[PDB]
Design a protein around this ligand. Structure first.
Ligand SMILES: Nc1ncnc2c1ncn2[C@@H]1O[C@H](COP(=O)(O)OP(=O)(O)O)[C@@H](O)[C@H]1O
Lengths: 186, 53
């Protein structure tokens, strides 16, 4: 068999097997729901919408945003997102691969514990891991030492990494990411 | 010399022709007892609110 990785670095969400050059496709992690009485009786009512489907559908939908400050706000919504992503894009079953999780560093245990709890229970999945952004950033950039700045959709980072080790005291973590900037924009 | 069919029919007709009386009687009287419900349209409001904040 084969091994599969979810990116849950915030913004559009990235998922792909080991060894593909780039993830198959990517989704905002918008979540949105209806705003108005449903008045085409012909329409099937679906009460929650996600992804480019929503990105099209947006106007009467209204958004919820399931990650604040890199902290994922509402678990069951995530579960909706996650399920959708597997089945609709990936055509994948939880047994199929080990799965790898992508985490803001230095943030509350709860995200660890519930994430794992859900994904081992709700999905049933051979192997699990959660990994800190900077490590990946080095591996891709291929210099065993370094310091990384990556200010995504979500909380904004400084980590020096020396070759082969962490300096967790060294590390700085900031909620300055582009979303809040954008809301300043208005 | 009289009060007659002719005059009574005149009155009848005028009655029929007077729109103001009959329309006012129906619409204005019926306008007052207009409304009682916990609207489902407002159910939408409440649900949205739930989703809102
Ligand atoms: N073309 C672009 N130019 C500049 N910024 C962008 C562009 N596309 C997306 N972004 C921003 O980059 C971020 C995308 O999320 P991401 O960087 O993956 O966050 P995270 O680090 O949490 O994964 C968002 O802040 C988004 O607004």
């Amino acid at each position: 068999t084969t091994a599969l990785v979810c990116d849950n670095g915030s913004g559009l969400v990235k998922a792909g097997f080991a060894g593909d050059d780039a993830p198959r496709a990517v989704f905002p992690s918008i979540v949105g729901r209806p705003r108005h009485q449903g008045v085409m009786v012909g329409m099937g009512q679906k009460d929650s919408y996600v992804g480019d489907e929503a990105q099209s559908k947006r106007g009467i939908l209204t958004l919820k945003y399931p990650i604040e400050h890199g902290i994922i706000t509402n678990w069951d919504d995530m579960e909706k997102i996650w399920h959708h992503t597997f089945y609709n894009e990936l055509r994948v079953a939880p047994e199929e691969h080990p799965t790898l999780l992508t985490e803001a560093p230095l943030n509350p245990k709860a995200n660890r514990e519930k994430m794992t709890q859900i994904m081992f229970e709700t999905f049933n999945v051979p192997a699990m891991y959660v990994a800190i952004q900077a490590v990946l950033s080095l591996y891709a950039s291929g210099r065993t030492t370094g310091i990384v700045l990556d200010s995504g959709d979500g909380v904004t980072h400084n980590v020096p990494i020396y070759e082969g080790y962490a300096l967790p005291h060294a590390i700085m973590r900031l909620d300055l990411a582009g979303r809040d900037l954008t809301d300043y924009l208005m | 010399x009289x009060x007659x069919x002719x005059x009574x029919x005149x009155x009848x007709x005028x009655x029929x022709x007077x729109x103001x009386x009959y329309x006012x009687x129906x619409x204005x009287x019926x306008x007052x007892x207009x409304x009682x419900x916990x609207x489902x349209x407002x159910x939408x409001x409440x649900x949205x609110x739930x989703x809102x904040x």
